[PDB]
Design an enzyme around this catalytic site. Sequence first.
Site, PDB file in Angstrom:
ATOM      1  N   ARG A 184      -0.452   9.069   0.979  1.00 42.09           N
ATOM      2  CA  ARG A 184      -1.202   9.058   2.230  1.00 42.09           C
ATOM      3  C   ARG A 184      -0.559   8.161   3.279  1.00 42.09           C
ATOM      4  O   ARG A 184      -0.857   8.304   4.469  1.00 42.09           O
ATOM      5  CB  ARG A 184      -2.641   8.605   1.976  1.00 42.09           C
ATOM      6  CG  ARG A 184      -2.751   7.117   1.681  1.00 42.09           C
ATOM      7  CD  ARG A 184      -4.098   6.726   1.098  1.00 42.09           C
ATOM      8  NE  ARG A 184      -4.024   5.406   0.481  1.00 42.09           N
ATOM      9  CZ  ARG A 184      -4.086   5.187  -0.829  1.00 42.09           C
ATOM     10  NH1 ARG A 184      -4.237   6.205  -1.667  1.00 42.09           N
ATOM     11  NH2 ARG A 184      -3.995   3.952  -1.303  1.00 42.09           N
ATOM     12  N   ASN A 185       0.314   7.240   2.868  1.00 40.04           N
ATOM     13  CA  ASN A 185       0.969   6.319   3.786  1.00 40.04           C
ATOM     14  C   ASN A 185       2.443   6.644   3.986  1.00 40.04           C
ATOM     15  O   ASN A 185       3.204   5.800   4.469  1.00 40.04           O
ATOM     16  CB  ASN A 185       0.792   4.879   3.305  1.00 40.04           C
ATOM     17  CG  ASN A 185      -0.645   4.417   3.405  1.00 40.04           C
ATOM     18  OD1 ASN A 185      -1.351   4.769   4.351  1.00 40.04           O
ATOM     19  ND2 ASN A 185      -1.087   3.629   2.433  1.00 40.04           N
ATOM     20  N   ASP A 216       0.845  -1.189   0.000  1.00 43.51           N
ATOM     21  CA  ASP A 216       0.000   0.000   0.000  1.00 43.51           C
ATOM     22  C   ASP A 216       0.884   1.245   0.000  1.00 43.51           C
ATOM     23  O   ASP A 216       0.763   2.139   0.834  1.00 43.51           O
ATOM     24  CB  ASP A 216      -0.961  -0.014   1.186  1.00 43.51           C
ATOM     25  CG  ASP A 216      -2.134   0.936   0.996  1.00 43.51           C
ATOM     26  OD1 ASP A 216      -2.269   1.506  -0.109  1.00 43.51           O
ATOM     27  OD2 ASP A 216      -2.920   1.114   1.950  1.00 43.51           O
ATOM     28  N   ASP A 270       5.097   1.406   7.915  1.00 45.47           N
ATOM     29  CA  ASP A 270       5.512   0.011   7.783  1.00 45.47           C
ATOM     30  C   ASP A 270       4.643  -0.888   8.652  1.00 45.47           C
ATOM     31  O   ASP A 270       5.128  -1.766   9.368  1.00 45.47           O
ATOM     32  CB  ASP A 270       6.986  -0.152   8.143  1.00 45.47           C
ATOM     33  CG  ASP A 270       7.362   0.582   9.417  1.00 45.47           C
ATOM     34  OD1 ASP A 270       6.477   1.220  10.028  1.00 45.47           O
ATOM     35  OD2 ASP A 270       8.546   0.520   9.811  1.00 45.47           O
TER      36      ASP A 270
END
Length: 265
Positions: free
Chosen positions: A132-133, A128, A146
């Site tokens: 945004r991450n 992903d 992570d």
Amino acid sequence: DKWEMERTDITMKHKLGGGQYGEVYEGVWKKYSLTVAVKTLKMEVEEFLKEAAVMKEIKHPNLVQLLGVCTREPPFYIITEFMTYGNLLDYLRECNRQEVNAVVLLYMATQISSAMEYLEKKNFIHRDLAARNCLVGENHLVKVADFGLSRLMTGDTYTAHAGAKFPIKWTAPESLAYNKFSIKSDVWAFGVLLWEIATYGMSPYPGIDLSQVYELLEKDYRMERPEGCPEKVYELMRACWQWNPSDRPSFAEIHQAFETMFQES
């Protein structure tokens, strides 16, 4: 082990990120007067504990650092460092572009590719990768979240569970069609992440219907070079978006290419 901690050691505060990340809170580690991110459970318990155990083995300057866990008795805590400026997507959309200029974007891409090169070498996949991450600290420090890491010997394929739903516009073609994920599908998502960075947080494939993304990709449709994006960066994007996963570059090669560009600026 040495990671275990007493929940009393942490004082909870506001839920962060507007809830988009689930049950994640800003917290205080009272012993060191340290603002931390606390992650709690309220997914299954065993997946939560596995994701804590995986992060114990992870150590890289551009991957969110685990600080402690409360796994003996519920409620369970995963405690990590707190990144002051939130997620990279909101940071790019709201930033001063005179400060966060082209060389800073190169710096941030070099950091992210360094984290992904480390995961590539340690036989992990992310699954992903997106703006945004990613999280932003002081002085344009960027760390990749992570928390959804999976073990996979670099070169093998992971098949997502039946009925899984994916962020379509970040998802590699082999994953959309066959639920197959690999480090090469992380490379595909990194290319989309690159596009987010070069556009200061624009939504990818703007206006394009999600139902037609895969069929567009089948006919070699790819996003266009963003305004002001250097051609060499855009060609790195397009290499990440090769149809055949084996034709996409490795994160080692990607990081080497960005390191060279960053030093030359």
